[PDB]
Scaffold this active site. Structure first.
Site, PDB file in Angstrom:
ATOM      1  N   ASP J  38       0.833  -1.200   0.000  1.00 46.86           N
ATOM      2  CA  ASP J  38       0.000   0.000   0.000  1.00 46.86           C
ATOM      3  C   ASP J  38       0.869   1.252   0.000  1.00 46.86           C
ATOM      4  OD1 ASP J  38      -2.129   1.780   0.176  1.00 46.86           O
ATOM      5  OD2 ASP J  38      -2.750   1.166   2.182  1.00 46.86           O
ATOM      6  N   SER J  39       1.667   1.420   1.046  1.00 46.17           N
ATOM      7  CA  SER J  39       2.733   2.401   1.005  1.00 46.17           C
ATOM      8  C   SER J  39       3.931   1.822   0.256  1.00 46.17           C
ATOM      9  CB  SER J  39       3.125   2.826   2.418  1.00 46.17           C
ATOM     10  OG  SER J  39       3.673   1.739   3.143  1.00 46.17           O
ATOM     11  N   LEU J  40       4.838   2.715  -0.139  1.00 47.27           N
ATOM     12  CA  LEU J  40       6.088   2.431  -0.844  1.00 47.27           C
ATOM     13  C   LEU J  40       5.886   1.753  -2.199  1.00 47.27           C
ATOM     14  N   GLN J  42       3.115   3.523  -4.081  1.00 47.73           N
ATOM     15  CA  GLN J  42       2.410   4.705  -4.548  1.00 47.73           C
ATOM     16  C   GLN J  42       3.147   5.963  -4.125  1.00 47.73           C
ATOM     17  OE1 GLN J  42      -1.637   4.698  -3.151  1.00 47.73           O
ATOM     18  NE2 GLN J  42      -2.348   6.311  -4.535  1.00 47.73           N
TER      19      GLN J  42
END
Ligand SMILES: CCCCCCCCCCCCCCCCCC(=O)OC[C@H](COP(=O)([O-])OCC(O)COP(=O)([O-])OC[C@@H](COC(=O)CCCCCCCCCCCCCCCCC)OC(=O)CCCCCCCCCCCCCCCCC)OC(=O)CCCCCCCCCCCCCCCCC
Ligand SMILES: CCCCCCCCCCCCCCCCCC(=O)OC[C@H](COP(=O)(O)OCCN)OC(=O)CCCCCCCCCCCCCCCCC
Lengths: 167, 165, 57, 114, 90, 74, 141, 458, 56, 83
Positions: J38-40, J42
């Site tokens: 999810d992070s890293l 986008q």
């Protein structure tokens, strides 16, 4: 704003605050994956306080010791020369009154200037036909149908569709 | 002193216009990224800014801090003015060590340019007059006052050593 | 736009015009020609000194 | 100093139905842009937030006012307060100067101007 | 987000089309209109500097004879005694 | 225009890139290094020197004092 | 010619829920933390119902603020809280209240006592007694 | 004035006698011809004094003061034509005649030869100015401000008839200021205090104080069409010069009670400057500036002893041109934006670059640039009251510092961006907008060339 | 001796000449940064002259 | 003084696909949609343009940046690209 995307607003600035303090490029680059291992503590879990206590301790050591005069990317909300180009400042539609022999120059430009106005002069048989229809009563952000269901012209015509270019 | 920073802001102004938007000490690089001349112009100025060993303002800077020998001060004053001579000197290398020394790093589309004889006329006219500033004017002057002419042991030129450290 | 005197780059070290470096080289020498008059002839204190001025008797 | 300013608080799930306070302003924003975009306006927007601002500030404060409290009579400690004090300075002044001007002399003899 | 897909496709066909419209210079569209119209160094400086010399010097020669305080030049500052005087000094 | 082609730099020397070897005791490891190693290597290790480089390499610091001194001298 | 709720009135408890928002929409439905209760303390000449003060304040500071213009330049519709003090004022930085500058100015407050001392160059101190002997005592011979 | 009132009264049977729209070009044409006749017979020499003809004129010998009185009538007709042309012609011509009638009483005034003809001419005004506030003004709350425009000046001026006739029946006759050679002194009593009190207090009604001045930001706030009689109201406030006529003699020695007029006009001086940095009105913005350095002159007069009459002669005309010019700036930028509130004027300096020079030099007369007619007199107020005591430089100097901000507080409001609005306000500063904006600094710095005529006796 | 300070008054006069030519009174084909630079260029040797008479 | 056209960004967005060593140079050029790569993912996928372009990347730039050509689309609106 939601709890899951509250992580994302901190995650970009967590590393953006660090390159302010670095001296090399690899010195900053070595601490990218090095700080990633702290982010890899809780990979995927529930959305409860266990995900909030990871952020509740991200209150300290993020605001605590935060960016001693950081990089600002000068074309920004802050930063020097952010709105410096203001001697020009793009006065869009300052060109109504001319009293010609001053409208002598740019002949084809004025011939096209009145041409685009008919797109704005004839839109309220279409844009206002859906403006009463697309808004349910008084609800949210009021962009139209982005094709306007036949031809989107613009919907934001023309002060936004011919908005001010920068130089 | 009037020779110094009108050169220096203008010499550093060509550097900022070369990148056209950062004006930060961050993201600069080394001195030699096809930059021969303006780096030579800075080290004329920065070494003078260390506290004048024999550069441009030597006949004014040295004849005052060694005129602080005979005085009637607070004696906190000589314990405050002479310390800043080091603090003046560390201003010099700070743009050497961060904009002129390290590896090249700044964003791409490297559009540097140093070829305009309009600017070359300005820099060449200053540094000819800049180096001979304190050495021609003070060379021919009617005297007004009496010099010090006594600068004893452990009391004479150690402010230059303050610049060295 | 109008002129291509200095080329755009992508960090390949675009070369110089090789004529500014002559004038760069010249004024690195006449400033160290001025290391002549630093010592020659100029000393740190052309004054003379005091023998810890004791002999009052 | 001025301020902390408390830019962070808690959520999840305090006041789930508190949202869409932007629905008050986006309806006005839809009423704004529909008024803003038109082929012929040739004039300023009425903008009644500035109409209700100055007229309820420059006027309609004295109809609001009553002297029913002493913190409204508190202006006696700011208006007439130092106004006595400058005269309390100045009445002590100009007479001590005059007595040294009457009895004895201190001025230079070439004081034609003045 | 799939909602703005039809957005910014017709806007590039309107905003950049307006910028395609704004990029417009038909045969350097200055008319101007009507009408028209180094080594010398003969009168560009002679009108500049060489003319106001005589005017202001006339304003000083016609000034000393009128005003009782002309130029108020200071003393001699002479250590020996010289030929402008008759005596000398050691 | 087409100067940044891929498989061009392909980190080979670069003692700055030894920190990517330093994380081998942890393991991250491959992605990526070419961002910070964009313009470090090549002729970008020219590496202007210490106090000698502010003397400009001792190239002109002491040139003309021995040639000027000296004649006549009687 | 706008007469209906043209300004504020003698509030703040004349059915304050019917104030916001029958007109002057400072609150949506009288529970928005901006219902016209905040008549500071009244009795004075302050603001009445007053679509005015103690609403969230201390800066319009020209932020990023893209959903409208909405910060300070570009006229959001009706959100007036206070004005004429904010075109030149800001929010909180990273440090906090600590008045160290008076302690920083106290660095000479120790040396303000040093202003009473003298500054003769030669000889050295030897501060033990009157053997320093500053001025002239005896004659020539 | 042998024949100065005589040609200008013949201008009155020319308005309704004339044709159609020719009435503007005809009225301005005749008007400037009198301006040379003003200059010609006056400005004579000059050593105590020029008693002019007879019992109706003393020729304004010590202070000329009369040239400024005659610029304005061929200066406001070009200004009032901004928003007046909507009515019947017979109604518009009446609005022309009443302003011309305002000058004729003031032509006989400022010279006046006497005191019993002074007061009837001192009260001969306030009849035409009041009618201008009633008809063809702006929006409502006019009529109370018309009542506040009365009931102060008339309230204070009535004891002058109690004072002057009490002098006329007692010692000689006040027909002649020059038969005032024998003047008995006035001792401290409980009757003579009131004799000085009524002699002075009426003159504080017009040039204001920290008290009794609430009416002054009513006529300037609620004002006629576009600064029309507001320019005349500038001369109406500065035209309270008659304290120079009266208290120069006729109880001069009562200075024991001078102090509460010194002090009240001094802390009120520094206060009313800062009482407008949070004001939200343009026509009120210049109004509170026009209180402060107009209240500067009062301590220059009650303190006697010249090097104070020198600057006070010049400080009457100082803002008299300046605040008249600032109102010309404020009368403009209202035909284009139909609200006078200053905050709505964000995004200027780009649509009107030509008048942007005129904003600069106008507000450069409050900082005032010491080779001008403004800081040449304020240095003499320094030169007087510092001899009074050493404290007086403090409160008077901060007045030179508050209006430094308070003037540039207006200039920076012109510079903003993107303007949000304004499909109207197109007009790029037509000929009437800038030719009328001229002829203010054009005599002002002209008078700074040889400022010899701007000097009292003194 | 009269030309000790007379050249100073010439130096204190030619600065007004780019200002006098701002009134569009047969002004030069514009080149105004160039024309100002030329206007400064001749004043320097005029400024150089009375410095020699002072030090004598 | 140097201008810019459409072809410069069509190099760089395609180049950083191969610069990031997690993404091989065998994906789609302009429309990979990033969910198939999810992070890293986008933020890290645009943290490199934080280094190279770096105009602070506002909050609305995340939810648009799935379509990798829709990344490229609004930059010409921001950077005011030719015609
Ligand atoms: C095609 C070619 C045509 C050929 C044209 C003819 C050739 C040129 C004519 C020759 C020069 C005459 C013009 C006057 C300027 C020079 C004056 C001078 O120095 O001689 C002293 C001489 C004085 O006479 P004097 O015999 O030596 O002694 C008598 C006095 O006792 C002396 O003492 P004083 O009482 O005069 O006191 C000194 C002072 C005092 O005078 C004043 O300042 C008083 C005026 C202001 C009073 C306040 C008024 C407020 C309302 O006077 C001055 O101001 C001198 C400054 C320069 C003149 C001011 C210009 C104003 C415009 O002349 C004057 O000063 C008279 C002043 C009249 C001004 C006329 C201005 C005309 C301008 C025409 C337009 C030109 C525009 C050019 C633009 C070009 C493109 C940028
Ligand atoms: C309140 C009114 C105060 C008047 C008190 C009575 C004054 C008086 O009696 O006259 C004083 C004096 C004449 O009377 P006398 O003392 O006998 O002198 C010898 C001549 N017979 O000498 C005089 O004639 C002095 C004349 C001036 C005094 C009258 C005006 C004083 C009132 C002005 C104050 C301001 C106005 C206040 C009212 C307006 C506002 C509401």
């Amino acid at each position: 704003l939601t709890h899951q995307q509250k992580v994302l607003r901190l995650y970009k600035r967590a590393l953006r605050h660090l390159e302010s303090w670095c001296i090399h490029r690899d010195k900053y680059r070595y601490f990218a994956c090095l700080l990633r291992a702290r982010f890899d503590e809780h990979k995927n879990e529930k959305d409860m306080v266990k995900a909030t206590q990871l952020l509740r301790e991200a209150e300290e050591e993020f605001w605590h010791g935060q960016h001693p005069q950081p990089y600002i990317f000068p074309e920004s909300p802050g930063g020097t020369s952010y709105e410096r180009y203001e001697c020009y400042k793009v006065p869009e539609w300052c060109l109504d009154d001319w009293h010609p022999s001053e409208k002598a120059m740019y002949p084809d430009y004025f011939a096209k200037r009145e041409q685009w106005k008919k797109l704005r002069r004839e839109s309220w048989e279409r844009e206002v036909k859906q403006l009463q229809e697309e808004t349910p009563v008084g609800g949210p952000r009021t962009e139209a149908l982005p094709p306007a269901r036949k031809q989107g012209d613009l919907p934001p015509l023309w002060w936004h569709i011919v908005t001010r270019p920068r130089e | 002193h009037a020779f110094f920073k009108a050169m220096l802001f203008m010499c550093s102004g060509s550097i900022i216009h070369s990148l056209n938007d950062e004006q930060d000490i961050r993201k600069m690089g080394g001195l030699f990224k096809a930059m021969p001349f303006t780096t030579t112009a800075l080290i004329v100025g920065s070494l003078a800014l260390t506290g004048m060993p024999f550069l441009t303002g030597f006949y004014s800077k040295d004849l005052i801090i060694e005129a602080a020998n005979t005085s009637y001060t607070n004696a906190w004053a000589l314990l405050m003015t002479l310390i800043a001579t080091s603090f003046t000197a560390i201003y010099s290398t700070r743009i050497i060590f961060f904009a002129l020394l390290g590896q090249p790093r700044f964003p791409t589309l490297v559009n540097i340019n140093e070829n305009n004889p309009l600017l070359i006329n300005s820099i060449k006219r200053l540094l000819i007059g800049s180096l001979f500033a304190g050495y021609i004017i003070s060379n021919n002057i009617p005297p007004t006052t009496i010099p010090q002419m006594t600068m004893p042991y452990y009391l004479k030129t150690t402010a230059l050593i303050v610049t060295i450290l | 736009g109008g002129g291509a005197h200095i080329e755009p780059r992508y960090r390949q070290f675009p070369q110089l015009t090789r004529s500014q470096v002559i004038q760069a080289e010249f004024f690195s020498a006449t400033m160290w020609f001025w290391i002549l008059w630093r010592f020659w002839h100029d000393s740190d204190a052309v004054l003379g000194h005091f023998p810890y001025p004791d002999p009052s008797q | 100093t001025t301020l902390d300013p408390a830019e962070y608080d808690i959520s999840s799930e305090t006041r789930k139905a508190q949202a869409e306070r932007l629905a008050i302003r986006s309806r006005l924003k839809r009423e704004y842009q529909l008024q803003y975009y038109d082929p012929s306006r040739r004039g300023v927007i009425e903008d009644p937030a500035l109409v209700r601002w100055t007229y309820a500030r420059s006027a309609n404060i004295y109809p609001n006012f009553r002297p029913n409290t002493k913190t409204s009579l508190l202006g006696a400690l700011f208006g007439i307060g130092p106004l006595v004090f400058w005269y309390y300075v100045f009445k002590t002044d100009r007479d001590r100067k005059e007595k040294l001007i009457q009895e004895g002399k201190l001025d230079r003899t070439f004081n034609i101007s003045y | 987000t799939p909602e703005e897909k039809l957005r910014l496709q017709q806007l590039r066909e309107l905003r950049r089309r307006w910028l395609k419209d704004q990029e417009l210079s038909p045969r350097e569209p200055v008319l101007p209109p009507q009408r028209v119209s180094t080594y010398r160094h003969s009168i560009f400086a002679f009108t500049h500097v060489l003319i106001p010399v005589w005017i202001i010097h006339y304003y000083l020669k016609y000034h000393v004879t009128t005003k009782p305080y002309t130029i108020v030049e200071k003393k001699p500052r002479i250590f020996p005694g010289d030929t402008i005087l008759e005596t000398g000094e050691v | 225009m087409e100067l940044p082609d891929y498989k061009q730099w392909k980190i080979e020397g670069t003692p700055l890139e030894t920190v990517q070897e330093k994380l081998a005791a942890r393991g991250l490891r491959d992605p990526w290094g070419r961002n910070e190693a964009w313009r470090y290597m090549g002729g970008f290790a020219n590496n202007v020197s210490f106090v000698g480089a502010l003397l400009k390499g001792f190239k002109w610091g002491f040139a003309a004092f021995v040639v000027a001194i000296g004649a006549e001298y009687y | 010619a706008s007469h209906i709720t043209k300004d504020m009135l003698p509030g703040p408890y004349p059915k304050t829920p019917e104030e916001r928002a029958a007109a002057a929409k400072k609150y949506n439905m009288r529970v928005e933390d901006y219902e016209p209760y905040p008549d500071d303390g009244t009795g004075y000449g302050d603001y009445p119902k007053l679509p005015d003060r103690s609403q969230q304040e201390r800066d319009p500071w020209y932020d990023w603020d893209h959903p409208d213009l909405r910060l300070n330049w570009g006229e959001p519709m009706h959100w007036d809280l206070d004005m004429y003090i904010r075109n030149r004022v800001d929010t909180s930085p990273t440090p906090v209240n600590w008045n160290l500058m008076c302690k920083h100015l106290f660095g000479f407050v120790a040396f303000m006592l040093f202003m009473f001392w003298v500054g003769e160059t030669y000889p050295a101190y030897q501060p033990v007694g009157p053997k320093q002997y500053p001025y002239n005592n005896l004659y020539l011979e | 004035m042998l024949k100065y009132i005589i040609p200008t009264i013949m201008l009155m049977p020319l308005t309704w006698l004339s044709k159609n729209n020719m009435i503007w070009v005809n009225s301005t044409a005749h008007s400037l011809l009198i301006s040379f006749t003003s200059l010609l017979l006056m400005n004579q020499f000059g050593d105590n004094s020029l008693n002019f003809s007879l019992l109706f004129f003393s020729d304004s010998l010590s202070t000329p003061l009369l040239i400024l009185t005659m610029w304005l009538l061929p200066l406001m007709l070009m200004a009032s034509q901004h928003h007046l042309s909507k009515e019947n012609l017979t109604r518009k011509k009446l609005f022309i005649t009443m302003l011309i009638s305002l000058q004729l009483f003031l032509i006989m005034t400022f010279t006046a030869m006497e005191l019993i003809l002074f007061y009837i001419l001192f009260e001969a005004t306030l009849v035409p100015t009041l009618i201008i506030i009633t008809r063809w003004g702006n929006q409502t709350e006019r009529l109370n401000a018309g009542l506040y425009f009365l009931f102060y000046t008339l309230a204070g001026s009535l004891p002058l008839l109690v004072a002057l006739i009490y002098i006329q029946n007692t010692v000689g006759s006040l027909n002649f200021l020059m038969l005032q050679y024998w003047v008995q002194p006035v001792h401290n009593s409980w009757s003579n205090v009131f004799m000085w009190l009524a002699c002075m207090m009426a003159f504080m009604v017009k040039m204001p104080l920290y008290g009794l001045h609430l009416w002054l930001p009513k006529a300037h706030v609620e004002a006629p069409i576009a600064g029309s009689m507001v320019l005349a109201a500038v001369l109406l406030k500065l035209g309270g010069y008659g304290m120079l006529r009266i208290t120069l003699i006729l109880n001069p020695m009562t200075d024991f009670m001078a102090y509460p007029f010194i002090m009240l006009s001094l802390w009120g001086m520094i206060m009313t400057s800062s009482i407008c940095l949070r004001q939200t009105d343009l026509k009120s913005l210049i109004a509170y500036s026009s209180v402060s350095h107009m209240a500067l002159v009062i301590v220059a007069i009650l303190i006697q002893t010249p090097w104070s009459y020198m600057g006070a002669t010049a400080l009457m005309i100082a803002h008299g041109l300046t605040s008249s010019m600032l109102f010309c700036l404020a009368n403009s930028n209202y035909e284009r934006i139909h609200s006078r509130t200053m905050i709505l004027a964000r995004g200027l300096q780009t649509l009107l670059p030509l008048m942007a020079t005129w904003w600069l030099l106008a507000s450069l007369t409050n900082l005032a640039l010491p080779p001008t007619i403004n800081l040449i007199g304020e240095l003499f107020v320094v030169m007087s009251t510092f001899s009074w005591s050493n404290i007086t430089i403090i409160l008077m100097g901060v007045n030179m510092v508050i209006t430094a901000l308070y003037s540039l507080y207006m200039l920076i409001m012109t510079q903003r961006g993107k303007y949000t609005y304004h499909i109207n306000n197109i007009s790029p500063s037509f000929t009437r907008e800038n030719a009328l904006m001229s002829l203010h600094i054009l005599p002002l710095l002209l008078l700074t060339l040889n400022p010899k005529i701007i000097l009292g006796p003194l | 001796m009269n030309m000790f300070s007379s050249l100073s008054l010439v130096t204190l006069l030619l600065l007004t000449m780019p200002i006098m030519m701002m009134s569009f009174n047969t002004y030069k084909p514009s080149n105004y940064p160039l024309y100002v630079k030329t206007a400064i260029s001749y004043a320097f040797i005029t400024s150089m002259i009375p410095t020699m008479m002072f030090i004598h | 003084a140097p201008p810019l056209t459409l072809e410069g960004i069509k190099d760089r967005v395609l180049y950083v696909l191969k610069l990031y060593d997690k993404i091989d140079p065998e994906k789609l050029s302009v429309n990979s949609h990033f969910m198939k790569d999810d992070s890293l993912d986008q933020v890290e996928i645009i943290m490199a343009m934080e280094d190279e372009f770096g105009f602070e990347i506002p909050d609305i730039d995340a939810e648009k940046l799935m379509c990798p050509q829709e990344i490229v689309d609004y930059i010409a609106d921001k950077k005011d690209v030719y015609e």
